[PDB]
Design a protein around this ligand. Structure first.
Ligand SMILES: [Au+]
Ligand SMILES: [Au+]
Length: 65
């Protein structure tokens, strides 16, 4: 239960891409995105830095909360 704020995730198509990115890295992850708040909640066995690095490479640099 890690949370990120993703300033570039401003609508639905962005969020979809964020979610697909995470699910490709860990098919067992659960991911929630809220375009109103730009917040992304992730449950995963991977580290926050591994999730962040993947999101960065995809053009959605996060900030962990
Ligand atoms: Au978007
Ligand atoms: Au999910």
């Amino acid at each position: 239960g890690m949370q990120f704020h993703i300033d570039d995730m401003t609508c639905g198509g962005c969020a979809s891409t964020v979610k697909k990115t995470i699910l490709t890295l860990d098919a067992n992850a659960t991911v929630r995105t809220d375009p109103a708040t730009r917040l992304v909640d992730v449950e995963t066995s991977l580290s926050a830095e591994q999730i962040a690095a993947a999101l960065q490479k995809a053009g959605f640099p996060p900030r962990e909360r």
